[PDB]
UniProtKB/Swiss-Prot annotation:
It catalyses: D-glyceraldehyde 3-phosphate = dihydroxyacetone phosphate. Homodimer. It comes from Trypanosoma brucei brucei. Disulfide bonds: none annotated. This is Triosephosphate isomerase, glycosomal. GO terms for cellular component: cytoplasm; cytosol; glycosome. GO terms for molecular function: triose-phosphate isomerase activity.
Length: 233
Protein backbone atom coordinates (compact mmCIF):
# COMPACT_ATOMS: atom_id res chain seq x y z
CA UNK A 1 0.00 0.00 0.00
CA UNK A 2 0.90 3.71 -0.20
CA UNK A 3 3.12 5.28 2.47
CA UNK A 4 1.86 8.19 4.56
CA UNK A 5 0.83 10.97 2.19
CA UNK A 6 2.12 14.53 2.43
CA UNK A 7 0.24 17.72 1.64
CA UNK A 8 2.76 20.54 1.45
CA UNK A 9 2.17 24.19 0.66
CA UNK A 10 5.06 26.24 -0.69
CA UNK A 11 5.10 29.98 -0.10
CA UNK A 12 6.16 32.29 -2.93
CA UNK A 13 -3.42 37.05 3.73
CA UNK A 14 -1.01 34.61 5.36
CA UNK A 15 -2.65 35.12 8.78
CA UNK A 16 -6.09 34.27 7.42
CA UNK A 17 -4.86 31.07 5.75
CA UNK A 18 -3.16 29.95 8.94
CA UNK A 19 -6.37 30.43 10.92
CA UNK A 20 -8.24 28.48 8.28
CA UNK A 21 -5.65 25.71 8.59
CA UNK A 22 -5.81 25.74 12.40
CA UNK A 23 -9.60 25.38 12.26
CA UNK A 24 -9.50 22.43 9.85
CA UNK A 25 -10.32 18.98 11.23
CA UNK A 26 -8.18 16.54 9.30
CA UNK A 27 -9.62 13.08 9.77
CA UNK A 28 -7.00 10.86 8.13
CA UNK A 29 -3.26 10.28 8.34
CA UNK A 30 -1.39 12.90 6.35
CA UNK A 31 1.67 15.00 7.12
CA UNK A 32 0.91 18.59 6.27
CA UNK A 33 3.68 21.08 5.66
CA UNK A 34 3.77 24.84 5.32
CA UNK A 35 6.98 26.04 3.69
CA UNK A 36 7.89 29.66 4.28
CA UNK A 37 10.47 32.13 2.99
CA UNK A 38 12.81 33.18 5.82
CA UNK A 39 11.05 36.46 6.68
CA UNK A 40 7.71 34.74 7.30
CA UNK A 41 9.13 31.81 9.31
CA UNK A 42 8.82 33.32 12.78
CA UNK A 43 5.20 34.40 12.36
CA UNK A 44 4.15 31.13 10.68
CA UNK A 45 5.90 29.14 13.39
CA UNK A 46 4.02 31.02 16.11
CA UNK A 47 0.60 31.25 14.44
CA UNK A 48 0.39 27.76 12.94
CA UNK A 49 -0.61 25.40 15.72
CA UNK A 50 -2.35 22.50 13.99
CA UNK A 51 -0.38 19.50 15.23
CA UNK A 52 -0.66 17.64 11.87
CA UNK A 53 1.34 20.50 10.30
CA UNK A 54 5.05 21.19 10.45
CA UNK A 55 6.85 24.32 9.31
CA UNK A 56 9.41 24.08 6.53
CA UNK A 57 12.16 26.46 5.50
CA UNK A 58 13.21 26.89 1.87
CA UNK A 59 16.53 26.97 0.02
CA UNK A 60 18.97 27.23 2.95
CA UNK A 61 22.35 25.96 1.75
CA UNK A 62 24.72 27.10 4.48
CA UNK A 63 25.57 24.76 7.37
CA UNK A 64 25.35 27.45 10.06
CA UNK A 65 21.98 28.61 8.75
CA UNK A 66 20.72 25.01 8.74
CA UNK A 67 21.88 24.58 12.34
CA UNK A 68 20.15 27.81 13.35
CA UNK A 69 16.89 26.76 11.68
CA UNK A 70 17.01 23.42 13.50
CA UNK A 71 17.78 25.19 16.78
CA UNK A 72 14.81 27.43 15.97
CA UNK A 73 12.46 24.43 15.79
CA UNK A 74 12.29 24.01 12.02
CA UNK A 75 12.81 20.39 10.99
CA UNK A 76 11.67 20.39 7.36
CA UNK A 77 13.04 22.14 4.29
CA UNK A 78 12.17 22.38 0.60
CA UNK A 79 15.09 22.39 -1.86
CA UNK A 80 15.51 22.42 -5.62
CA UNK A 81 12.16 24.03 -6.37
CA UNK A 82 11.90 24.86 -10.05
CA UNK A 83 12.75 28.56 -10.05
CA UNK A 84 15.85 27.83 -7.98
CA UNK A 85 17.11 25.96 -11.01
CA UNK A 86 15.82 27.94 -14.03
CA UNK A 87 16.35 31.40 -12.53
CA UNK A 88 18.73 31.32 -9.57
CA UNK A 89 21.05 28.88 -11.31
CA UNK A 90 21.12 26.11 -8.73
CA UNK A 91 22.59 23.20 -10.68
CA UNK A 92 21.86 19.52 -10.08
CA UNK A 93 24.96 19.40 -7.90
CA UNK A 94 24.21 22.55 -5.92
CA UNK A 95 20.74 21.17 -5.08
CA UNK A 96 22.24 17.79 -4.24
CA UNK A 97 24.76 19.42 -1.90
CA UNK A 98 22.00 21.39 -0.20
CA UNK A 99 19.93 18.23 0.20
CA UNK A 100 22.90 16.39 1.71
CA UNK A 101 23.74 19.24 4.08
CA UNK A 102 20.14 19.42 5.29
CA UNK A 103 19.89 15.67 5.83
CA UNK A 104 23.11 15.79 7.83
CA UNK A 105 21.70 18.67 9.89
CA UNK A 106 18.68 16.56 10.84
CA UNK A 107 16.09 17.82 8.35
CA UNK A 108 13.28 16.08 6.55
CA UNK A 109 13.89 17.25 3.00
CA UNK A 110 11.41 17.82 0.19
CA UNK A 111 13.70 17.76 -2.85
CA UNK A 112 12.19 18.98 -6.10
CA UNK A 113 12.97 17.82 -9.64
CA UNK A 114 11.27 18.42 -12.96
CA UNK A 115 11.82 19.26 -16.61
CA UNK A 116 11.05 22.37 -18.70
CA UNK A 117 8.81 22.66 -21.77
CA UNK A 118 11.87 22.67 -24.04
CA UNK A 119 13.17 19.56 -22.29
CA UNK A 120 9.87 17.74 -22.42
CA UNK A 121 9.36 18.57 -26.11
CA UNK A 122 12.85 17.34 -27.00
CA UNK A 123 11.72 14.00 -25.53
CA UNK A 124 14.16 14.35 -22.64
CA UNK A 125 11.86 14.18 -19.61
CA UNK A 126 13.39 10.95 -18.37
CA UNK A 127 17.06 11.81 -18.88
CA UNK A 128 16.60 15.27 -17.34
CA UNK A 129 14.49 14.21 -14.35
CA UNK A 130 16.51 11.06 -13.57
CA UNK A 131 19.77 12.96 -13.93
CA UNK A 132 18.48 15.44 -11.36
CA UNK A 133 17.59 12.74 -8.85
CA UNK A 134 20.79 10.80 -9.63
CA UNK A 135 22.82 13.82 -8.52
CA UNK A 136 20.86 13.94 -5.28
CA UNK A 137 21.33 10.22 -4.71
CA UNK A 138 25.09 10.51 -5.29
CA UNK A 139 25.46 12.67 -2.14
CA UNK A 140 23.25 10.45 0.02
CA UNK A 141 23.61 7.09 1.71
CA UNK A 142 20.77 4.57 1.55
CA UNK A 143 19.62 5.20 5.13
CA UNK A 144 19.21 8.91 4.31
CA UNK A 145 16.22 8.22 2.11
CA UNK A 146 14.15 7.89 5.28
CA UNK A 147 14.56 11.67 5.51
CA UNK A 148 13.88 12.41 1.83
CA UNK A 149 10.68 13.23 -0.05
CA UNK A 150 10.68 13.82 -3.80
CA UNK A 151 8.47 16.41 -5.47
CA UNK A 152 7.99 16.20 -9.24
CA UNK A 153 7.30 19.60 -10.81
CA UNK A 154 6.01 19.58 -14.41
CA UNK A 155 7.81 22.85 -15.12
CA UNK A 156 6.68 22.38 -18.73
CA UNK A 157 3.09 22.84 -17.55
CA UNK A 158 3.78 25.78 -15.28
CA UNK A 159 3.29 29.17 -16.94
CA UNK A 160 3.44 27.73 -20.45
CA UNK A 161 -0.27 27.34 -21.10
CA UNK A 162 0.36 23.60 -21.33
CA UNK A 163 -1.86 21.33 -19.21
CA UNK A 164 -0.79 18.12 -17.45
CA UNK A 165 -3.15 15.15 -17.19
CA UNK A 166 -3.23 12.68 -14.27
CA UNK A 167 -1.80 10.06 -16.63
CA UNK A 168 1.11 12.34 -17.50
CA UNK A 169 1.68 12.93 -13.80
CA UNK A 170 1.51 9.19 -13.06
CA UNK A 171 3.94 8.49 -15.92
CA UNK A 172 6.50 10.84 -14.42
CA UNK A 173 6.05 9.59 -10.85
CA UNK A 174 6.34 6.01 -12.10
CA UNK A 175 9.60 6.51 -13.94
CA UNK A 176 11.01 8.17 -10.81
CA UNK A 177 9.89 5.31 -8.60
CA UNK A 178 11.28 2.78 -11.07
CA UNK A 179 14.65 4.52 -11.01
CA UNK A 180 14.61 4.54 -7.21
CA UNK A 181 13.69 0.87 -7.10
CA UNK A 182 16.54 -0.14 -9.43
CA UNK A 183 19.29 2.21 -8.26
CA UNK A 184 18.57 2.58 -4.54
CA UNK A 185 16.36 -0.35 -3.56
CA UNK A 186 12.78 -1.61 -3.87
CA UNK A 187 12.46 -1.18 -0.11
CA UNK A 188 13.37 2.50 -0.41
CA UNK A 189 11.09 2.89 -3.44
CA UNK A 190 8.11 1.46 -1.59
CA UNK A 191 8.40 3.88 1.33
CA UNK A 192 9.36 6.98 -0.65
CA UNK A 193 6.81 9.77 -0.90
CA UNK A 194 6.65 11.28 -4.40
CA UNK A 195 4.55 14.43 -4.43
CA UNK A 196 2.98 16.08 -7.43
CA UNK A 197 4.09 19.71 -7.73
CA UNK A 198 2.09 20.96 -10.72
CA UNK A 199 -1.31 22.64 -11.04
CA UNK A 200 -3.68 21.28 -8.43
CA UNK A 201 -7.08 22.18 -7.03
CA UNK A 202 -10.17 20.63 -5.44
CA UNK A 203 -11.40 19.49 -8.84
CA UNK A 204 -8.37 17.40 -9.80
CA UNK A 205 -6.41 16.80 -6.59
CA UNK A 206 -8.49 13.76 -5.69
CA UNK A 207 -8.10 12.40 -9.22
CA UNK A 208 -4.33 12.91 -9.15
CA UNK A 209 -4.01 11.28 -5.75
CA UNK A 210 -5.75 8.17 -7.01
CA UNK A 211 -2.77 7.53 -9.28
CA UNK A 212 -0.58 4.60 -8.18
CA UNK A 213 2.64 6.56 -7.64
CA UNK A 214 1.34 9.88 -6.30
CA UNK A 215 1.78 10.35 -2.54
CA UNK A 216 0.53 13.90 -2.11
CA UNK A 217 1.17 17.41 -3.29
CA UNK A 218 3.52 20.37 -3.21
CA UNK A 219 1.08 23.18 -3.86
CA UNK A 220 0.57 26.90 -3.43
CA UNK A 221 -0.16 28.45 -0.07
CA UNK A 222 -3.86 29.12 -0.76
CA UNK A 223 -7.36 28.55 0.71
CA UNK A 224 -8.01 25.57 -1.59
CA UNK A 225 -5.02 23.89 0.08
CA UNK A 226 -7.63 22.57 2.53
CA UNK A 227 -9.22 20.69 -0.36
CA UNK A 228 -5.79 19.44 -1.41
CA UNK A 229 -5.23 18.01 2.08
CA UNK A 230 -8.63 16.29 2.00
CA UNK A 231 -7.77 14.92 -1.45
CA UNK A 232 -5.06 12.76 0.11
CA UNK A 233 -7.28 9.74 0.60
Amino acid sequence: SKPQPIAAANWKSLSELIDLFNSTSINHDVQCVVASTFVHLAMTKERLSHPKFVIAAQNAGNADALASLKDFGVNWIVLGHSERRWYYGETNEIVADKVAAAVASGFMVIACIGETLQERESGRTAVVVLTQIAAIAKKLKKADWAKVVIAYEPVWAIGTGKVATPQQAQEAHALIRSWVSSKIGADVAGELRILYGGSVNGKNARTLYQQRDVNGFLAGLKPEFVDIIKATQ
